[PDB]
């Protein structure tokens, strides 16, 4: 079967970290992995040719390994779009897998990618997580605490999130627009459909670069 | 009724941020609120005179407003010690409140302190909080996901945690040693005892300085 990387890049990913755009750092981490067929990057339609320029400029040796495609309005629409681009490259079979990952998580390691791929063999999906270190409070109303979850069972969700392309299409396709609005996480869709989602070990350093503070942390990390 | 600040300081709080220790930064924000009767600081037994010298050196003008006392083995014992220090200073009424706050959260704002005091009026306790940024995943088994709760209902706990001194003492005194181990922060005690704890709005800039990089970030903010 095939294994693809699905890079969600639909913004800080076009910003330089060190001497290369964040997006490039992230794609770089996937190019060495021998078991990856293509690296499929979902970008906002207006930034597709820009993303292609970056590949030409920063990763010319890996041009043919990388497919830039139009992402969607939310992450799951981008995943679907990625899977469609994959299907257009080589018609999907039930066993073909996509390793989905945030563009702004440049500190992913081969160990994480490899664990995700390995876990996907015997499970429906894989979610990369770390132990939650934040104290988490629940409030449905946003006015008072409706409860405090048992912290012993809480994890901070990261990416990759890994699953069979066909499996994601089938489950996502079964959702109403209203359900898609609520079930914004790909693993959540598998979980609520009663599927087996294994935990993969993330890393505290697997930072998501969202805010200008995250950017500062990222810069300090590359030394 | 009196309003007190209860600063939990026991180790980054004694490290310099700009030109002053972080602890002094944190104390200063509470001095900005005129309605605070005393700022009570719980530190490690051996660090009391050190913290006193810090107050003398950096806030001599405000030293009368600050009490340094010996904190405890966990944050809840330190809160207990703080409240006993308050009671030693001025006998408690059932309505005196304590605004408890991490020493290593020096970017607390006046607004946050004010909201905590206001919200404590009509509630059992107050938890200062921000909307959760990460997707939280639950696994009761450590192997597969048992739930991914809706992130829109989830909040990252910060401090201040504010409540009436007597109320804390009453609830805390009713716990066994094992409960006290699981009920690790004040608001958790309140919630499990079926009390009403209001959310106060925190800030994403209300950084808890735990790690070396937190300190680096704090420095860049100042
Ligand atoms: Ca097809
Ligand atoms: Ca609607």
Description:
The structure is a homodimer. With 223 residues, chain A is an alpha/beta fold. Chain A has helices at residues 22-31, 48-58, 75-89, 110-120, 165-173, 177-182, 186-192, 212-221; strands spanning 3-9, 16-17, 20-21, 39-43, 66-70, 97-102, 125-131, 136-138, 154-164, 197-201. Chain A has one domain: Alpha-Beta Complex (Spore Coat Polysaccharide Biosynthesis Protein SpsA, Chain A). In chain A, strands 5-4-1-6-9-7-10 form a 7-stranded mixed beta sheet, with helices on both faces. In chain A, strands 2-3 form a two-stranded antiparallel ribbon. In chain A, β2 (16-17) and β3 form a beta hairpin. Chain A starts with a strand and ends with a helix. Bound molecules: calcium ion (2 copies). The site of one calcium ion (CA) has 3 residues of chain A, from loops. It is classed as transferase. Keywords: transferase, nucleotidyltransferase, tari SPR1149 CDP ribitol streptococcus pneumoniae techoic transferase, isoprene biosynthesis. The assembly is dimeric.
